[PDB]
Symmetry: C2
Subunit: 60 residues, 2 copies
């Protein structure tokens, strides 16, 4: 019976493992979404500020 209880408890534990893996990878996905949108934001903001400082220096 020791083998069967190890079996079934490890089965529930691998279920817990798969679900915690799923939530971990979902957190990974949402983090990646935040990352990509802020990469776009940084890109557009930096290009804009570069153009603006160039225009300011040329105006001076």
């Amino acid at each position: 019976q020791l083998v069967e209880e190890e079996l079934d408890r490890a089965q529930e534990r691998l279920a817990t493992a798969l679900q915690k893996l799923e939530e971990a990878e979902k957190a990974a996905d949402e983090s990646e979404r935040g990352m990509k949108v802020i990469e776009s934001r940084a890109q557009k903001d930096e290009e804009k500020m570069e153009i603006q400082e160039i225009q300011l220096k040329e105006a001076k």
Copy 2:
């Protein structure tokens, strides 16, 4: 017997899942780190952009 062989199979799947969860945790945390640093960069560059364009206005 064969039951304990099944136990070993279940536990090796468990160990594989543990390695997977460790990788996933590392990935998620480092991803959040990149996210926060890029958000900081975006905010600071936006501030620089706005002050630059206001100064450009005054210069014009």
